Amino acid sequence: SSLHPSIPCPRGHGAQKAALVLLSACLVTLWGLGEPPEHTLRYLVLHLASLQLGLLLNGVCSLAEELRHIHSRYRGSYWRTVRACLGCPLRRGALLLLSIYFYYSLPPFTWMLALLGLSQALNILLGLKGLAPAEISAVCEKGNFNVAHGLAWSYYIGYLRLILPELQARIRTYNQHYGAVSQRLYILLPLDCGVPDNLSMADPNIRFLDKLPQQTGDRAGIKDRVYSNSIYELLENGQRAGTCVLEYATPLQTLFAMSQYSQAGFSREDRLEQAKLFCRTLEDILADAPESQNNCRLIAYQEPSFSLSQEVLRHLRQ
Amino acid sequence: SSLHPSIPCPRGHGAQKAALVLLSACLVTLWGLGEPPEHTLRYLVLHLASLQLGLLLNGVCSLAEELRHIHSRYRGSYWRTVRACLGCPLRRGALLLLSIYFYYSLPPFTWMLALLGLSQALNILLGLKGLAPAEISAVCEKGNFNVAHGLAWSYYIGYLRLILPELQARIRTYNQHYGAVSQRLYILLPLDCGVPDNLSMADPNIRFLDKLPQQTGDRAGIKDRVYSNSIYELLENGQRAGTCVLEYATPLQTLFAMSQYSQAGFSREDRLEQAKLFCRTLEDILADAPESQNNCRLIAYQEPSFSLSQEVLRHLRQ
Amino acid sequence: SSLHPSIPCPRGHGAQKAALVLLSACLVTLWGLGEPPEHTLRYLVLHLASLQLGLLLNGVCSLAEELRHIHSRYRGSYWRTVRACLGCPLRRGALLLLSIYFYYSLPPFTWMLALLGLSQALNILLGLKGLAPAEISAVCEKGNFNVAHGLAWSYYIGYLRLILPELQARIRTYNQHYGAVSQRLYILLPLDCGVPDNLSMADPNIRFLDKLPQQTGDRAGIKDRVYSNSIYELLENGQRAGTCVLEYATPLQTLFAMSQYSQAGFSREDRLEQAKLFCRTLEDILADAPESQNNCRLIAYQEPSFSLSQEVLRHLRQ
Amino acid sequence: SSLHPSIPCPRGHGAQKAALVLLSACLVTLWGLGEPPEHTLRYLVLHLASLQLGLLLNGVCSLAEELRHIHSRYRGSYWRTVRACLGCPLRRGALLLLSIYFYYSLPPFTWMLALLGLSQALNILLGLKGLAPAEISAVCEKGNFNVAHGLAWSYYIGYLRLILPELQARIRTYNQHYGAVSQRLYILLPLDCGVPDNLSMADPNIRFLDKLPQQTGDRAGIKDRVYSNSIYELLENGQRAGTCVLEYATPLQTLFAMSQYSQAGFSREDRLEQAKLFCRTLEDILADAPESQNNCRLIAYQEPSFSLSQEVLRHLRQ
Ligand SMILES: CCCCCCCC/C=C\CCCCCCCC(=O)OC[C@H](COP(=O)(O)O[C@@H]1[C@H](O)[C@H](O)[C@@H](OP(=O)(O)O)[C@H](OP(=O)(O)O)[C@H]1O)OC(=O)CCCCCCC/C=C\CCCCCCCC
Ligand SMILES: CCCCCCCC/C=C\CCCCCCCC(=O)OC[C@H](COP(=O)(O)O[C@@H]1[C@H](O)[C@H](O)[C@@H](OP(=O)(O)O)[C@H](OP(=O)(O)O)[C@H]1O)OC(=O)CCCCCCC/C=C\CCCCCCCC
Ligand SMILES: Nc1nc(=O)c2ncn([C@@H]3O[C@@H]4COP(=O)(O)O[C@H]5[C@@H](O)[C@H](n6cnc7c(N)ncnc76)O[C@@H]5COP(=O)(O)O[C@@H]3[C@@H]4O)c2[nH]1
Ligand SMILES: Nc1nc(=O)c2ncn([C@@H]3O[C@@H]4COP(=O)(O)O[C@H]5[C@@H](O)[C@H](n6cnc7c(N)ncnc76)O[C@@H]5COP(=O)(O)O[C@@H]3[C@@H]4O)c2[nH]1
Ligand SMILES: CC(C)CCC[C@@H](C)[C@H]1CC[C@H]2[C@@H]3CC=C4C[C@@H](OC(=O)CCC(=O)O)CC[C@]4(C)[C@H]3CC[C@]12C
Ligand SMILES: CC(C)CCC[C@@H](C)[C@H]1CC[C@H]2[C@@H]3CC=C4C[C@@H](OC(=O)CCC(=O)O)CC[C@]4(C)[C@H]3CC[C@]12C
Ligand SMILES: COc1cc(C(=O)O)ccc1NCc1ccc(C2(C(C)(C)C)OCC(C)(C)CO2)cc1
Ligand SMILES: COc1cc(C(=O)O)ccc1NCc1ccc(C2(C(C)(C)C)OCC(C)(C)CO2)cc1
Asked: Which GO BP annotation is one of this protein's (chains A, B, C, D)?
């Protein structure tokens, strides 16, 4: 979280520690109450069996919908749909057999089955299966089910991986042909996702000077596709203080626009979260990329009395 | 789903219908067993209360972690963390009060609380909270937690929304200055995410003719940023069958690249699913967008003896 | 397994199916014997508890050795060594607490602990912890703990990924400057790992003609490093039948040499297994590589009356 | 371990010493409890018998899978499959007979057999057979199931074994034809697996001078295959401090590339561990090899303000 304090760090294992504490407390309580541990084990196994039966019923309900997509999503394989709706069928079947055995054989099975089915049907019909926001966010981060992930990887693959290697050569060409621009690309990251097309509008102290020699390449059927960069001077008290190849991170614009459109199903809180996740993912990518060797500098900032030029200079002086 | 049969349709409400059938069957079974409805109601309420207590315990365990990211992800408010780990605190508290009342008033409590805590801690520690793939997919599609969503919206907002309005002008200018090219942009959507840099390599019948006039605009500080498109000749039996503005969808490339790098946590099945999702999302956007005044055509194909030129010609002759 | 029938296919899930059958049979037997399921559950839990205690003791024994490598292998972290010797400490501790509870509370703990420690110490001192060859092989394949894996990836990265793209250009140059060599590189894979330096020795029907224009590049501090390929004519009944860019897979030589040297700890059975695994891994890599697009052909063969030239021709004619 | 302190030493016998201590402590505890030794012996034998039965059941489950690969991995002999799934059948049968005899002759059998089968099937289905990382590492190092082993042996057999003998001739030829370069080859071993293509890029003080005479030889059908080495100048304060034949170890590059591709199943921790293992294995090979008549020097370093040229000079001045 060196970019900005507001960047969330990845989740740890606090839930497991709290669960261990809870387990210890529950065991202590059961010991204090002084009840037969045999009954404890019996009822715990029965509870887990009920959970397994509930999973079975919910998966059966979801199977009715998922079979409609058998040819598209699951390649015509019934076993694939079953695995998607229930997980590993072997494990689930073994657990079901064990539950049946330890219920029908321990101190009515069909009545309890009907009751559990009624409860699951109620939970489904009334829309009570929804997870809490924190669990959804954790699942999405673990599985990388985020738009920011794809946006950052697209930014790295399509632009930086094709731009950074030739940046030094282009800079040397511009410097010898013409001034002492720093040998790095400075990428701005406004967590508010406010990305204007002209920096001079955001801060007069930043002023355009010229353009580097255009880079060219063929991309996805389009040939002679050109990437261009701009040179900006940073002023202090009306006098020049630095010069750099500065630009905004274009994908953030998208995050803003997606929040304006209603067809995108994207809100402002999602916008903030995804912008910060984008910054984090891009930092993680660059920290390990061989292309990026002191060639790029990310400047992340959040507007609360704020001067962008001074922010850029605080990094340039280093 | 006119693009390609392999594109899955959005999920419907089959699960709820299955749940209704299950509920009716369970009620019929309970009626047949002849058990008194009051006992059924009591036990159902107790089961729902147990579910609520389990939710509370799991939410506490998750809060133990979220309190760390309080400042960076919840704006320093404990109430937001609680609402994220448990949902609406008012509803949860009401349900907990009702559960306590109807557990103590109906034919111990701390013992079962300890058992439920034990079960929840066991599920957390052993990693049994994992959802089935179908549930995760449904959650992501409903909440738009996919990379394809962002990729498609970026493609529309950064490229098409700026290119389609001015396309006919460039095309007519090229025609006057020189070829009878159709007035429509053609975008290829390979579901295998091939995306070669040279189209002629994919099919010899596809050959370059000339570039349209360049379009220019300022974007994200980079001024005079240039968008260029390429004309292509479609041959049939060694003869000029047609001419069109043709290009691949660049984001697919990214997906492919994301399926190769290990740092992305992206697999090939995820690649195919996200490609289909990207195509469907883009189709919907273009259907609702006003810029797409028949100025674009999407071509989605899946290689099995396949001729890309033939498919493009088929879409052209319409 | 299209290369050769002798190539083993990856392992499936037959063990899990057999385990499910075994579980069903055991449950049926317990039902037939008509003993109290409470006793069954009790003794099953006790057995699992004993297994957990054995794991704890074995991990404690291994910890004494692994602490000597704390600074080198585990970066001075005691928790990392503990996780390496015991797995997730939270889960293991929870299971230990549960085992202690359900043993000391169900119908002497210290005596059984001493007995289990004695048994584990015997198993360690007498070297009885060794796994069977099949389990070791499965573990190595799942974790890619094989020399052939690294050899194949090295062959792809260092040679093919740098050779295939320019192969067509070099072939066209040679053909226009001089005959109609097929536009593919043919790589021989002798599963016996017998790789001579001159093919003419292996089969007179194969005869050297000339060399393609050398490819050049800088690699790992060495500049102007050159890759060269040879052209070979394949004869029939004394008359020419084909011409191709043919070569052996160099890494196989290593596999042979490693079997000759004693310092390598490599046998002939390992040689065969690793050669076949190398072929399989290379095939899997090429099937998904974008560089390989009809540019390479693998010819795997096993000498039992064998003609290499006819083997090459059977692929050339296609 | 003179290369670098971070290189781990081979594992010793600390586990056996800990096991001996544990056994002595357990015997003392049993003596203190005052239990009769005959009961101890009976229960210990029963425990060992249970372990044998579990091994048998797991071996049967694994045989259910290995019978599929019988032809492709065991030469069509069922006895080899049995020996792979169970070990020496004679010893296993003897132990099973003894177990049966001492279980039936000492104070049911089928019931406990069913319980053990249930436990084994449960462990198999739930994936509880996974070894701890330290045990896997020990098994791989003892059996040489690492990629670094093969990479190091390939580096020695393909490059060094063919280059070191003829190095002094080339060096003296270059000296007569022109520079006072040392008579030793210098190999860099970055544990981070950086391996840039240009050394001057890594450190400006490293600059190219000229190439040694090329070495030529026929290899794997490719005749006139060329090995080339490069001389480099080591500067200090802008002055020529030394000249040497310097190069990176190419296989490390491969490791890095394997840590990026997802198809390889190779992580960064595995990358570092395998780099250390490669360095150690190469050191041992060179120590035992006769070609290394002080003709090579290995330089292993780990970047923390680090000057590669200074380290090379330090190794040179000796
Ligand atoms: C049945 C009746 C008997 C019941 C027995 C009751 C036992 C109750 C047990 C356990 C309580 C668990 C509390 C969790 C620890 C506090 C967490 C924390 O506050 O930690 C505080 C510090 C760590 O702090 P930092 O290092 O600064 O933070 C890190 C860092 O930032 C990483 O970088 C980051 O990421 P990573 O590097 O790890 O990837 C990571 O995050 P992550 O770990 O969440 O992933 C962050 O935690 O540890 C500690 O001193 C705790 C040391 C544990 C001491 C031993 C356990 C207690 C003593 C005895 C227990 C009973 C033993 C059994 C005896 C026999 C039983 C019969
Ligand atoms: C407590 C008292 C009551 C106890 C109840 C007793 C129940 C006993 C249960 C289960 C026995 C398991 C046997 C395993 C199947 C045979 C394996 C095989 O021989 O299969 C034969 C074929 C598949 O053949 P192929 O497709 O040609 O081969 C593939 C292919 O090549 C893949 O390509 C490859 O790779 P992948 O594509 O999968 O990746 C893969 O390999 P992999 O699967 O190992 O990974 C290869 O198998 O399936 C079948 O017809 C079996 C269909 C199962 C039928 C349903 C189960 C039996 C009916 C009832 C069971 C009880 C139901 C419960 C009722 C209520 C209970 C109260
Ligand atoms: N600042 C900046 N200057 C550039 O020249 C540039 N070129 C690309 N990018 C950014 O890299 C990322 C990857 O582009 P990708 O091609 O994968 O998707 C691109 C691409 O599919 C399409 N597109 C954009 N510009 C062009 C273009 N000139 N030609 C063809 N397609 C284009 O629309 C997508 C989104 O573009 P932007 O979202 O505005 O910023 C892109 C993008 O975020 C640039 N960013
Ligand atoms: N047939 C053939 N013709 C070639 O020109 C060629 N060049 C490389 N290779 C093979 O690709 C693989 C990757 O080489 P890598 O550099 O990663 O390790 C190489 C490399 O580290 C080193 N080495 C081999 N040749 C050279 C060389 N000319 N210059 C420097 N180092 C070399 O020793 C290792 C093993 O080489 P080979 O095991 O004989 O075959 C190699 C290798 O199997 C070739 N194979
Ligand atoms: C309720 C319990 C007691 C019984 C569980 C039934 C098992 C016998 C099932 C569950 C998982 C099944 C397997 C899941 C996956 C596959 C892969 C499948 O191959 C395919 O991929 C077919 C689809 C396609 O090729 O598109 C062939 C059947 C098989 C082996 C299935 C065989 C039958 C299995 C073991
Ligand atoms: C026996 C049972 C009842 C108690 C189990 C003890 C737990 C409290 C232990 C087990 C795992 C431990 C964690 C394992 C990993 C780490 C990471 C560790 O951070 C490091 O990486 C330190 C080493 C380094 O930085 O090199 C700090 C402690 C912590 C959180 C540990 C905190 C204490 C934990 C939770
Ligand atoms: C990874 O292992 C697990 C996976 C899953 C899953 O796939 O969801 C669930 C639970 C898993 N392990 C915990 C667990 C498994 C089995 C049992 C058990 C006994 C066998 C104790 C006798 O009692 C309850 C039962 C009758 C229902 C089933 O059998 C208890 C606890
Ligand atoms: C992924 O889950 C598992 C992981 C591991 C592992 O880390 O090795 C082992 C076993 C796992 N699940 C199977 C299982 C867990 C727990 C128990 C249980 C009960 C809680 C049934 C009451 O009984 C036995 C016990 C007292 C020893 C522990 O608690 C039975 C079965």
From this structure: cytoplasmic pattern recognition receptor signaling pathway
